[PDB]
A paper describes a structure:
We chose the substitution to proline because it is known to inhibit fibril formation. These data suggest that the 91AEVVFT96 segment and the N-terminally adjacent region of full-length TTR are important for fibril formation.
Transthyretin (TTR)3 is a 55-kDa protein that aggregates into amyloid fibrils under pathological conditions. In its native tetrameric conformation, TTR transports retinol-binding protein and thyroxine (T4) in the blood and cerebrospinal fluid. Amyloid aggregation of TTR occurs by dissociation of tetrameric TTR into monomers; these partially unfold into amyloidogenic intermediates and self-associate into soluble oligomers and amyloid aggregates.
Author numbering:
A (entry chain A), B (entry chain B), C (entry chain B), D (entry chain A): 10 to 124
Amino acid sequence: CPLMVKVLDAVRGSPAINVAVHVFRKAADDTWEPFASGKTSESGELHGLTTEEEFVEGIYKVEIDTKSYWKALGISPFHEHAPVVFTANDSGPRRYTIAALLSPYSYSTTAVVTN
Amino acid sequence: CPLMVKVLDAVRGSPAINVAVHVFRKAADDTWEPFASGKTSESGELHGLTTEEEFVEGIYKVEIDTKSYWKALGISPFHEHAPVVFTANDSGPRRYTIAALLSPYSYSTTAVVTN
Amino acid sequence: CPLMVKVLDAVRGSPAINVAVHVFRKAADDTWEPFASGKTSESGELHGLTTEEEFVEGIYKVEIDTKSYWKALGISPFHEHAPVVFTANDSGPRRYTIAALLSPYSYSTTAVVTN
Amino acid sequence: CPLMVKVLDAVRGSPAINVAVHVFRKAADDTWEPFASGKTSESGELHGLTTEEEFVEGIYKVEIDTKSYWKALGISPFHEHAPVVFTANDSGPRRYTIAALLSPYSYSTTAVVTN
Ligand code: NA
Ligand code: NA
């Protein structure tokens, strides 16, 4: 698996558990088409979204459902969700980790791309 | 000025100048409709996107064109752009500052909402 | 105003008001000597810490008292404080803004340095 | 091992490899005393700093040597280092991960405390 998502909670100092994540790929007609989805584990990680066979070059969007996460914790959030948009390029062997750090009114995202 | 955008460059420790920003608002048909756009100034700020009259309740997307910013500096970055999605003016008018802090493979965004 | 400090609260999406800040400068004996201090205003900013005359070359530490800020809000945070350590004015005078974005278990700090 | 350090590089989109990390504990005389140290691995992680026996309650400082990291990559940095200061409390079983995300003029740190 070439694409992993990891989410942390900056208020509790914990992995962000049970966060829904939806991945889309841009189609030929320029629309976002569903590609993969899941919920983060107890470690805040989401593994097994795709395979090397299916994860071809293209433009992808990883949407982290931040609003539902904060509401389930009884906390008042700002954003609807956190979308992370990027091109996947076959510049040799690569693994992509989309990491995100969440606060109710702020978030950061980092791409960790390794060989 | 109920909606302002501020962008900083984390590599240089400076305002991110001439960054293009496109704002959209979700329409009744659920599509993203163009709402306003502009570019950041020498201070990294973008003022005058809208007015209290035009900035009605709704779901908005502020898209910061991070890829074009890094490419104009001769750098190949990871993300296509940084979209920031939120509901605005649902409890009456507020002033919103959407701030972003950019690095080639990472960004943070914060909302500062004042009454 | 060659040294300014700005602090935001990532939980509320607001300026962090009344945050204590202590600045130190490394002395010849390698100890941290008090240099200036103050508290952030209603805008989350702290102005007037020093003057161009007093702000000589040196190694400085800007300590943001994050624990006292969260405790005054009735929250038990992780960090004791957020120290920001850097050399200043080594290539002539510059204006420095030390910005910090706070959450109970996490913070970010950015330096904006202008000539 | 109850204390782990993880560092990412926001410019390259990679683990921050070979970063020196120095941990100190506050002594009875209020001075910072060396406690443990090491360099991050190829995964950007530093394991085996201490043991449950030695990691008693107290005030600790984890110093990440950011300036030397950026200089070894041929990149111009702002901060001397990134110090992370906190109390370790035996509120039941706990593991502490000090995570940091580095850019030349900005960094973030998050504490992930799990049971
Ligand atoms: Na406006
Ligand atoms: Na000043």
